Amino acid sequence: DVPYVLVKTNMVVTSVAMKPYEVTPTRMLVCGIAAKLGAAASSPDAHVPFCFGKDLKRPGSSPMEVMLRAVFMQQRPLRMFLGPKQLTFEGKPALELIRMVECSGKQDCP
Amino acid sequence: DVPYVLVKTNMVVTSVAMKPYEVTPTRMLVCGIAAKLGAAASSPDAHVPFCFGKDLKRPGSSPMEVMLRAVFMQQRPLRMFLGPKQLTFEGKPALELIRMVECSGKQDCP
Amino acid sequence: DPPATVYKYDSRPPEDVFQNGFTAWGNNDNVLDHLTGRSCQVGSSNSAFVSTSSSRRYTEVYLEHRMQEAVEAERAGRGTGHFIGYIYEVRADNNFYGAASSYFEYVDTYGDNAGRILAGALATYQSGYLAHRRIPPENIRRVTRVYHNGITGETTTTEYSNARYVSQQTRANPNPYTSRRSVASIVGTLVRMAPVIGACMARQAEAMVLVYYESIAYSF
Amino acid sequence: PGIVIPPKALFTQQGGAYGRCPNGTRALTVAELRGNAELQTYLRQITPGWSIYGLYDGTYLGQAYGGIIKDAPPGAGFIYRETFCITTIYKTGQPAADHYYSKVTATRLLASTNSRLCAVFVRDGQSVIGACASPYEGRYRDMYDALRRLLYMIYMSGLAVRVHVSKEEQYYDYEDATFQTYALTGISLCNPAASIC
Amino acid sequence: GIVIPPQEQITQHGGPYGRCANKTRALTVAELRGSGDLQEYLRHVTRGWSIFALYDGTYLGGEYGGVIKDGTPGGAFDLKTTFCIMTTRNTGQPATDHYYSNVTATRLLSSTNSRLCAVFVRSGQPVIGACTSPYDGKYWSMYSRLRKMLYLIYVAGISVRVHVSKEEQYYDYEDATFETYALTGISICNPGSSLC
Amino acid sequence: LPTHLYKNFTVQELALKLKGKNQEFCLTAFMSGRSLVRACLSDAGHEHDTWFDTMLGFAISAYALKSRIALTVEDSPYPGTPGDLLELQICPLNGYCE
Amino acid sequence: VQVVESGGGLVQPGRSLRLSCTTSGFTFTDYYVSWVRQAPGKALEWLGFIRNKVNGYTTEFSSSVKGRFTISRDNSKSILYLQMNSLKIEDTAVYYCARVSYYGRGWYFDYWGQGTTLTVSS
Amino acid sequence: VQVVESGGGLVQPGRSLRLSCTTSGFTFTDYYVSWVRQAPGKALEWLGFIRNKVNGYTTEFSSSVKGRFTISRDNSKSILYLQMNSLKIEDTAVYYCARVSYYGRGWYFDYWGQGTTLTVSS
Amino acid sequence: VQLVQSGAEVKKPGASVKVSCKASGYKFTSYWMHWVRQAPGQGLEWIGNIFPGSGSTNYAQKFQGRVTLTVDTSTSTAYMELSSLRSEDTAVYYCTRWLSGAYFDYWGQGTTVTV
Amino acid sequence: VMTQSPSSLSASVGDRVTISCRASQDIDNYLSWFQQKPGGTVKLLIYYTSRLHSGVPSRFSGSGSGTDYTLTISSLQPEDIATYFCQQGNTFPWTFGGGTKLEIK
Amino acid sequence: VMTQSPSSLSASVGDRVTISCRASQDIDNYLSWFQQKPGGTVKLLIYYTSRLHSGVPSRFSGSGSGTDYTLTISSLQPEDIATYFCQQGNTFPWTFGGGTKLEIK
Amino acid sequence: IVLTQSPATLSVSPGERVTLTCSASSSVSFMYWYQQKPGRAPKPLIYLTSNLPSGVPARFSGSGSGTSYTLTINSLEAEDAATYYCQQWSSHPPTFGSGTKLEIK
Structure with missing residues (x-):
């Protein structure tokens, strides 16, 4: 686990996946891989996983899912809040996303 | 309100909207504007408004909404049942829709 | 008001554009067929309208996504990771025609049964202009050579000036275009995915993947 | 500024x-x-x-x-x-009435685990008003499942819209915002021939 | 040809001024x-000089002798009675399983409550019709899954196969030249596939 | 039971049928120059949950975009029969999975 | 299109007899068929008709003959039969087999056969 | 862009007064305005300011004069008023009304006017 | 950093062969390896590549269904297997490294196969 | 019930002749005609009030409304000797006429 | 509390002159300078550290960090005789300096 | 992609200047180059274009444009007796030229 929340700037969402949650049957995890625009190929921020748990007992799309679908289809840059807790994806560790905000400009996205 | 039901022919939907219900909660109205083919540039038969209600206790979508969305996106002529009651829309009263079918040809849509 | 400059994206090297310019394909001059994309499809590409854009932010974001495609392509396992792209500057003249106004003229003249709602949205989003059959090099002024170096990630931009450009004061035609009634049938509009760019615009830039627009506008 | x-x-x-x-x-x-x-x-x-x-x-x-x-x-x-x-919520304690704006276009998004989906509407390249909607809280929470579909529809295309706004409560989600945000209670597509926008 | 509804579907209280009840x-x-039985049942009930539209x-x-006259569509609804007929019937046949191979959807129909119906075509002629409803019917639980595919096929014009059930018959269309039953499946297939 | 991974395939067919007392959903993948892979998912065991509808929506969205997919299939206990679907992944648009 | 009847001859009170009307040239499962008579003194009298496939081959008659004459189809042979019960002492008439077409919003006949002769004596 | 003040003179102890600050050249509903003081033998001290339209016309006050000097706006006339519930001998000073801007993350004064003299005496 | 491979073999047609290319001197998990063969008196030809860190492979269309690339992390040795041999498959097989950029640098010996 | 008049009528070559045919009440333009040759042959001539069946010569004509309907032949030829009738289809059961004979002398 | 030095200073045309104004603790670069001519009008010269306001000639400049910040004049001209001040803007309430009187010999 | 080289074999006197060209059926952005010796593995020689790796002597250079690239040999020795190939990796899959061997007079 990462001891504190990390903030990355100017990434995009490039894939989406669905997989059952092992601990409790009443949830599943939506997972994707983010990439920083124009980043170095050897940089640690050029390939990063993330997941968040959806609920099943109530129908209808969660507020996160609609935004993720829209950004995935339209490919806009955004700012993502990652950490602190970690989950597993593809047999490897992955972070948990708490907040998600689209980018507005240079004053907001360094 | 008009005491008897009216029937319209060769109507095409051009705009949609969505607004709450004034007199009682747990209800919703869906409204729009319908244009008639062959009507004059300033004819009163152009831009006839229509509304219908929705119940909020049932998730998903009712069949009327699905048909409305399809015929709106595809821009096909339709046959309209309008009246007799009236409903509010943008500071003007508009009639209610009770049944709606797509035209097939000159046999039943002269 | 009509503008004086238009911009286009292409990949053909600048060393031969200045002697040849861009040319259309055939003699089909119907407007709705061009907007829907049926006349720009593979195996049916026969159109007399070259499509250009009048806003540079759209072309810049398009080229940025095209450049970024190569990075993930290389990481997947194919391609070196280097990209070369271009952005062109063309002068507008009275032979060009607007797209949104011509579409609305067609819809008004021939009724709502021949219209498609998202076609006008695509026309207004891309702020496109049609250059008719030919767009001669005399209106070509400047080019931008964008280079992406995959070994280190640096982005480099350079510019050059044409030796055959001619300066004249002429703006785009204000009168919309009129076309005859369509003889074919149209199911939907063709749209490239990520980003939403009209089929007719991206087909002249380059297998290709095209999906009906009305199928994605709502969430399944 | x-x-x-x-x-x-x-x-x-x-x-x-x-x-x-x-x-x-x-x-x-x-x-x-x-x-x-x-x-x-x-x-x-x-x-x-x-x-x-x-x-x-x-x-x-x-x-x-x-x-x-x-x-x-x-x-x-x-x-x-x-x-x-x-x-991020504030009850103004003010009488509610139908307030609306015209010729706007949605350009921004924001969400979290248990927060509203918010958007910023811009006219002529400048921000005008912000709106938000939630499925878990508020007086108008039942309309989220209905309004989200049309919101996504108007996001994908550059269609001009008229936005209805309620001022009984105010939201402070967007940090360092240069505009106000309120609740969303309606969406109407623009139509000039019928004198809506 | 034209499908002639049966006599047992008449409603005892006609609609007031042109608004029939739900369904x-x-x-x-x-x-x-x-129809002979419908004419026979119309007489022996109408009396005086009662006119109907x-x-x-x-x-x-009544005393006119039972004369039928032709007129414009929806041009006489102003009278105080209009004959209304139900659009649902139980057949009593067992749980069949029928399919109609290559077909394309062409028309849609909907009203308050009721159901959504489609008309399938092959080389320009109707073949069969199907309807789905979330309010009643044996297959109400399948609506939320079939409506997505029905929207997709209608928008994209996909040639598909249709699984239908002949337990129930519907008469939602006017002057239909085809039968209508309950939809129970749909499949997009390559020629000769096994999953169909 | 054995588990296998397939990458860089395309959805070619799609079906929704009533088989027995429960509904069923099947799909067929394709890649040039090799065999086909087929799997099915049944709304049995799962009930009073939104799992089936979400998976159906994801699969329909994947088919509509004509994009490449990565799928996990559980081996059928007897030959010539579809297996059980476990995981579905959408490859990047206009590209390939890593 | 050819429509020809067969059967008949002579019959005595209380004896049944089935007539055959065999057709060709059209799809037998989609059209209607009717039986008309011409008892001495003209005054052609309509008796009944059978329906097509889309309606389930139902039958409607006229007068008070309900409970006497019946109609059945053999769809695999394009042959239609007409069964009579106890023939009245006056039933003598040339029986005609004709097809029914539909146009606009009504019905009519279109084609006619030669006819068959039945004489009932005692 | 300029701003002019009017009013002043002599105020007896225990008497109230209100000043003025009239603006021109800039949109009055967008910018922050404030007040300044200058004791004859001392430096400059800050009193308070009124916010703009977006912030909902709220005001901030310094601890020196809390609950004595209020600030009000009149958008229809573009006039700033400053009320004084009580006045004492020590309050004789030259009063300035000034504007406030906003940079990256700060606030700064950019225009000042011309000033006026207010005196308390017996 | 060197690459060491197996020897030369001879096989009967209709069988299958399996070749090794062991790598040492660096972390093998984060670099692709390419497979290229050269027929006698003919030009080079591309077979496929594998990434040890993800296990994803890419093959040419004409070798689809015939070849299979595997890597063993314990011995840092890559394995190539080809089935249904014919007389046209006699060639010299090479293994080389890619740098996610730059160029191929470290090749290997011949490992000729005769069918 | 339904009646016709005259029962019999005669003419010669090139003689325009018209026959009458009426009903008890208004039948809403559902009236048909027939041609029964001298022995064992029936052929339809007009099915709607004015619409003409294929194969019938154009010389025949018909018009009417309400309760009055007439049929007109432009000119008589020898082949025209036959018996004509009428039939209505407004409501069940259908009914025919009494007949009308055309002769030459 | 805030102080300045020198309290008074005199020079001649062409003499580079600097004024030292300091604070009690870290202020994070929020100093603004002001010029007050004898006429009573008060104008702004530098608002954020080392950036020149519109209308002020390029002669004036500033520098500093932490607690010490120094204003510098390239050369004194007859129109520069006035009193200068330094104001902080980090925390409410704001405080002004004591001022410096600058004469010309 | 199809690559053509000419001549199949090259002969030259020591110390001279000679070049080889490999052409392509479609335009590609870059043109790699390789050197190959008999009985051993080939070794890299150029990457991208006109860009030498570490260790290769400076006496080798290359230049060209779209659909036509050249390799320039400016200092010949007995060591240069080898085979040269050119590679593309802009469109999947890569293609190699048939190659050309060098012979010393």
Whole structure:
């Protein structure tokens, strides 16, 4: 686990996946891989996983899912809040996303 | 309100909207504007408004909404049942829709 | 008001554009067929309208996504990771025609049964202009050579000036275009995915993947 | 050129540990701290003993040093244990009426675990008003499942819309916002021939 | 040809001024002409000089002698009675399983409550119709899954196969030249696939 | 039971049928120059949950975009029969999975 | 299109007899068929008709003959039969087999056969 | 862009007064305005300011004069008023009304006017 | 950093062969390896590549269904297997490294196969 | 019930002749005609009030409304000797006429 | 509390002159300078550290960090005789300096 | 992609200057180059274009444009007796030239 929340700037969402949650049957995890625009190929921020748990007992799309679908289809840059807790994806560790905000400009996205 | 039901022919939907219900909660109205083919540039038969209600206790979508969305996106002529009651829309009263079918040809849509 | 400059994206090297310019394909001059994309499809590409854009932010974001495609392509396992792209500057003249106004003229003249709602949205989003059959090099002024170096990630931009450009004061035609009634049938509009760019615009830039627009506008 | 200063009453007593504020709550910016005399005066009696506190893009110092405020790059305040968080809702206590705007276009998004989906509507390249909708809280929460479909539809295409707004409550989600945000209670597509927009 | 509804579906209280109740529709003149039992049941009930109006004409009864006349669509709804007929029937046949191979959807129909129906075509002629409803019917639980595929096929014009069930028959269309049953499946297939 | 991974395939067919007392959903993948892979998912065991509808929506969205997919299939206990679907992944648009 | 009847001859009170009307040239499962008579003194009298596939091959008659004459189809042979019960002492008439077409919003006949002769004596 | 003040003179102890600050050249509903003081033998001290339209026309006051000097706006006339519930001998000073801007993350004065003299005497 | 491979073999047509290319001197998990063969008196030809860190492979269209690339992390040795041999498959097989950029640098010996 | 008049009528070559045919009440334009040759042959001539069946010569004509309907032949030829009738289809059961004979002398 | 030095200073045309204004603790670069001519009008010269306001000639400049910040004049001209001030803007309430009187010999 | 080289074999006197060209059926952005010795593995020689790797002597250079690239040999020795190939990796899959061997007079 990462001891504190990390903030990355100017990434995009490039894939989406669905997989059952092992601990409790009443949830599943939506997972994707983010990439920083124009980043170095050897940089640690050029390939990063993330997941968040959806609920099943109530129908209808969660507020996160609609935004993720829209950004995935339209490919806009955004700012993502990652950490602190970690989950597993593809047999490897992955972070948990708490907040998600689209980018507005240079004053907001360094 | 008009005491008897009216029937319209060769109507095409051009705009949609969505607004709450004034007199009682747990209800919703869906409204729009319908244009008639062959009507004059300033004819009163152009831009006839229509509304219908929705119940909020049932998730998903009712069949009327699905048909409305399809015929709106595809821009096909339709046959309209309008009246007799009236409903509010943008500071003007508009009639209610009770049944709606797509035209097939000159046999039943002269 | 009509503008004086238009911009286009292409990949053909600048060393031969200045002697040849861009040319259309055939003699089909119907407007709705061009907007829907049926006349720009593979195996049916026969159109007399070259499509250009009048806003540079759209072309810049398009080229940025095209450049970024190569990075993930290389990481997947194919391609070196280097990209070369271009952005062109063309002068507008009275032979060009607007797209949104011509579409609305067609819809008004021939009724709502021949219209498609998202076609006008695509026309207004891309702020496109049609250059008719030919767009001669005399209106070509400047080019931008964008280079992406995959070994280190640096982005480099350079510019050059044409030796055959001619300066004249002429703006785009204000009168919309009129076309005859369509003889074919149209199911939907063709749209490239990520980003939403009209089929007719991206087909002249380059297998290709095209999906009906009305199928994605709502969430399944 | 300016920012909207959140009121003092939104200050959270139980701060977020290591940057994780509780759900439905957001951190605080240094600019929003330099414009609240009441909050600054109130804060002097709560931070004794050489303590240090973190912010979104800065750092706050305790009463032992004198309450100096210093700037920092974003994400640099979560390294410390204590952080300031503020609630993101506000009940104005004002009579409600139908307010609306015209010729707008949606351009922005925001979401979290248990928060609203929000958008910013812009006319002629400048922001006008913001709107939000939630499925878990509020008076108009039942309309989320209905309004979200049309919201997504008008996002994908550049169709002009008329937006209806209720002013009984106000939201402070977007940090350093140069505009106001309210609740969303309606959407109507533009049509000039029928004199709507 | 034209499908002639049966006699047992008549409603005892006609619609007031042209608004039939839910899950009901007005009777057409053509269907009226081609039925003997319906004519017999219309007489022995209408009396005095009572006039009645149908969907596409006028009906003179009582002491007029039962004369039927043709007219413009929806042009006579102003009278105080309009014949209304139900659009649902139970057949009693067992749980069949039928399919119609290559077909394309062409038309849609909907009203308050009721159901959504589609008409399938092959080389320009109707073949069969199907309907789905979330309010009643044996297959109500399948609506939320079939509506997505029905929207997709209608928008994209996909040639598909249709699984239908002949337990129930519906008469939602006016002057239909085809039968209508309950939808129970749909499949997009390559030629000779096994999963169909 | 054995588990296998397939990458860089395309959805070619799609079906929704009533088989027995429960509904069923099947799909067929394709890649040039090799065999086909087929799997099915049944709304049995799962009930009073939104799992089936979400998976159906994801699969329909994947088919509509004509994009490449990565799928996990559980081996059938007897030959010539579809297996059980476990995981579905959408490859990047206009590209390939890593 | 050819429509020709067969059967008949002579019959005595209380004796049944089935007539055959065999057709060709059209799809037998989609059209209607009717039986008309011409008792001495003209005054052609309509008796009944059978329906097509879309309606389930229902039958409607006229007068008070309900409970006497019946109609059945053999769809695999394009042959239609007409069964009579106890023939009245006056039933003598040339029986005609004709097809029914539909146009606009009504019905009519279109084609006619040669006819068959039945004489009932005692 | 300029601003002019009017009013002043002599005010007896225990008497109230209101000043004026009239603006021109800039959109009055967008910017922050404030007040300044200058004791004859001392430096400059800050009183308070009124916020703009977006912030909802709220005001901030310094601890020296809390609950004595209020600030009000009149958008229809573009006039700033400053009320004084009580006045004492020590309050004789030259009063300035000034504007406030906003940079990256700060606030700064940019225009000042011309000033006026207010005196308390018996 | 060197690459060491097996020897030369001879096989009967209709069988299958399996070749090794062991790598040492660096972390093998984060670099692709390419497979290229050269027929006698003919030009080079591309077979496929494998990434040890993800296990994803890419093959040419004409070798689809015939070849299979595997890597063993314990011995840092890559394995190539080809089935249904014919007389046209006699060639010299090479293994080389890619740098996610730049160029191929470290090749290997011949490992001729005769069918 | 339904009646016709005259029962019999005669003419010669090139002689325009018209026959009458009426009903008890208004029948809403559902009236048909027939041609029964001297022995064992029936052929339809007009099915709607005015619409003409294929194969019938154009010389025949018909018009009417309400309760009055007439049929007109432009000019008589020898082949025209036959018996004509009428039939209505407004409501069940259908009914025919009494007949009308055309002769030459 | 805030102080300045020198209290008074005199020079001649062409003499580079600097003024030292300091604070009690870290202020994070929020100093603004002001010029007050004898006429009573008060104008702004530098608002954020080392950036020149519109209308002020490029002669004036500033520098500093932490607690010490120094204003510098390239050369004194007859129109520069006035009194200068330094104001802080980090925390409410704001405080002004004591001022410096600058004469020309 | 199809690559053509000419001549199949090259002969030259020592110390001279000679070049080889490999052409392509479609335009590609870059043109790699390789050197190959008998009985051993080939070794890299150029990457991208006109860009030498570490260790290769400076006496080798290359230049060209779209659909036509050249390799320039400016200092010949007995060591240069080898085979040269050119590679593309802009469109999947890569293609190699048939190659050309060098012979010393």
